Amino acid sequence: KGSRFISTLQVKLYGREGSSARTIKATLPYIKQDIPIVIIFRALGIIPDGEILEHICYDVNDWQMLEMLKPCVEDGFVIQDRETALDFIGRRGTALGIKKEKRIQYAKDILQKEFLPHITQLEGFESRKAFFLGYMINRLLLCALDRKDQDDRDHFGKKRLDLAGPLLAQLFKTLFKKLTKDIFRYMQRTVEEAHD
Amino acid sequence: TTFRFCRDCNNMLYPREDKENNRLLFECRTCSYVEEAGSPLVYRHELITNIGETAGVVQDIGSDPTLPRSDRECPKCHSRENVFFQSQQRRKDTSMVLFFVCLSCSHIFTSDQKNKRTQ
Amino acid sequence: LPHFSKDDYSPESKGFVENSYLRGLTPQEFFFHAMGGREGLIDTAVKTAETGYIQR
Amino acid sequence: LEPGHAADQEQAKLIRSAIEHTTLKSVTIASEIYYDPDPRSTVIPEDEEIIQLHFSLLDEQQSPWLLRLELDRAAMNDKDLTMGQVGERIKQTFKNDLFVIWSEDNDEKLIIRCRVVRPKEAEEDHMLKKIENTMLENITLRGVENIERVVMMK
Amino acid sequence: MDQENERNISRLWRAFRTVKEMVKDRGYFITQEEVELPLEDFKAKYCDSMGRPQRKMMSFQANPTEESISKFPDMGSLWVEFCDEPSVGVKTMKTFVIHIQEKNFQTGIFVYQNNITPSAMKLVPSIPPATIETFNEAALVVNITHHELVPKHIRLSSDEKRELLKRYRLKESQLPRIQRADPVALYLGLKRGEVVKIIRKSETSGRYASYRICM
Amino acid sequence: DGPTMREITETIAEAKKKVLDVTKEAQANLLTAKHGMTLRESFEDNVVRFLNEARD
Amino acid sequence: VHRNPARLMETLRTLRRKGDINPEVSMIRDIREKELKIFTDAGRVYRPLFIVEDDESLGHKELKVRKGHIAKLMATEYQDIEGGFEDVEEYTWSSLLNEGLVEYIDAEEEESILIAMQPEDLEPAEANEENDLDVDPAKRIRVSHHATTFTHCEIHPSMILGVAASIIPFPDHNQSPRNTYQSAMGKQAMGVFLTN
RNA sequence: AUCGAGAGGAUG
DNA sequence: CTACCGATAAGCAGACGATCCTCTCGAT
DNA sequence: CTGCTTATCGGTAG
């Protein structure tokens, strides 16, 4: 019920089987490169290692899971603090140094809107999005170790049918908002005149 | 493997050799804390892995209707009630052995006549 | 199909039609033979556009 | 086959196992690192005499960190292989810069032990991992690269 | 490793053999007695006082058959050398050229064991009129023309070639073509212009003859 | 023929049973894998042939 | 998260079967993954079907809809034929959907259930028959019920078909691609297309 | 007449 | 024991995608 | 489910 904001997120796993060190990163909307996960969590509200791993892995018994994550941590010892956890997420412009306190407030709301716009899109929610981002990771790995199958794409329960109703909807909505801004553009041309 | 974390700060611990008395110390690159080691085991790879085979087993499994029901007996209790399934570990070169779940008691056993098992 | 248990690699489960065209297929059988025959029409539909580009 | 032979299967089997590619990787249960300090007395109880007969006191160092290798009693039957032939192709790879021990096929547990050696930035540890990496995907045991499953068809 | 000292020698022996077959096939003079030299008599005669195979002890010149002059008054003087040294820089290149330069040969074959440095390949063709060639032991353990799918090729002469070009009224371009680096075309050693003739067999008409110009 | 129709269903029944044993075997880890292919690959190949030979 | 979905599930399924929770909305309990997904999205496709339940007292495991239900169902479809002078009229389809006898099942929820095929021949008792004398030689060979812990049961298999396809006589005696042809031609035959 | 879309026929 | 050359392994991009036929509909 | 361009790797020469 918030139009059609198709904001698509991907969590990738770099390097193939038996490679040097397999590092985990993610694609975020309105951002140039990919970003190590450990930076993302710190940029949310979770700071310390081992607390990070509690959002991701759920059973502190099964190690291989854990031994998978050494590469990521060892990639984030360069950012340990709340504040500049978002300094790395500030490559939007070519040295927007004019925004040292504004790039943060550019990043701060990017994790309000562009990052998982469902779940919620308000202010006071960070542990809501962490447990999830940290559940995508439990899946992405629960597969790379080959403990569960890949996801099937032609499964009929994982697809919907855009009927006459919602067809009209995504049309009428677009129409109405066109007419709505035909009013504004007419109002700026009254007072101006009286008018009536 | 089982590696460990520091108190106070709460991060990961990275190994170190004691030059003098020859022993093993972990520590965080944040505060300074340093604890002694337990087992000499620092790293482990495993290419052929016996775990992952039997996941998702609960105390609420003898209810799922989509699982098949056989005429085995538990070598401990003796109830001909049980449910079963192949290796949940979806690899290509895996084996076709069954894993049964004693319902009157709660036990776990296999159909593999050869190959020793420790669960 | 949801008319079967899990982990069942027997003939009937995995698409062997016991019955002949005369005796008549059964419900599951019907549906399997369906998935099959379909592959025919699929190929001739979209594979020919290659077998005909080759010729050119 | 060579015209000199024809229906001698035993000949073909040889050629099969002189051609087929086999990496150290395909015969490894698990690789692992340990802190073993006392060279003569190991901290592990599974390796009492290895380590008990080696007979190194015929000459007669050192290295701190150790790297163990469990092997699968399984693929020592199909692919034709002996512990020795393994060990040799290992040392032959690096040359005179790492000690290497092992047990006999007769034993119940097949194992390898290795230790870096011996120059003269500490951080000695990370790299040791990139040896056990090179050790798996890059070590030939017998046969020609690019070749896989080789079939005995008549 | 005492078997890897025993195979290394055996492979060197078939490579030796294959070099012989090629030299005579260019048009030079070798007995079938010299080629079919058993593994015995080679175990000694070419090693040292222990069993280590001396390469410098194999090198030999080569003279054409009295029949080859009738078709090629040019072909006359060939020399082959083997080498102990694995890596061969610009320093080893200086030695061999100077050998021929004064001996006044025309063809220089050099069989190495591992590979040649690009600092050595730079100073190869820059010393005419004569020409030098090169081959990897590992690519000469087996003779390639001694294989089914390969038919026999026959270098034909200059005054000869003009005959093909008149009696099919062709232009140089119009012939089919063979590659300089081509396995066979090296096995004989072609040139910019030299034309082959190929006597392949056929299910249509017993024998069919194709001609290829070189590139 | 009635005598034949019977004989056909009985020539499917000893070939649906020859499959139950090749499963019954593979499931107690006695089924040796053919050189160069998976244990599951030699079961699959096995059964599929058991059912084709059954029809012809 | 929730602890003990033993009862939490059963309470959800009880209220939908009464009609309290909209019969559209679907509910997927996952034992072997420890998950519970509830879906309310628009576009899910679903279908019938009947319900089965061992909740029966002196009569093992059986279907819910009894012969008595069937009667009140035809005492409706005949009632509005001859004497339709307002003689207390009721008992439609939606009456079933509320008395809890039919459940709208979508594809995702189709993963957790064990559907039967033939109501009668799929839970009567043993004999058995298979190779046991005697039967009709000329009739077809059916799988046989071998698993018995059913939950649902299909309405009638012919219902897998479409509008054009259900025109075909004995489609289960035809080679499959043929029934697809007739489907395309049935739409190009000729007759009465509307009475007006 | 021109540009644009969709449905159908023949190889199944 | 450092810059200049050169030669190769590594990684983004392209221009193709059956023949013929019948009809209907909306558009600057 | 590619020929061509861009990038980082070793070789011998200032």
Ligand SMILES: [Zn+2]
């Ligand atoms: Zn600390």
Ligand SMILES: [Zn+2]
């Ligand atoms: Zn028990």
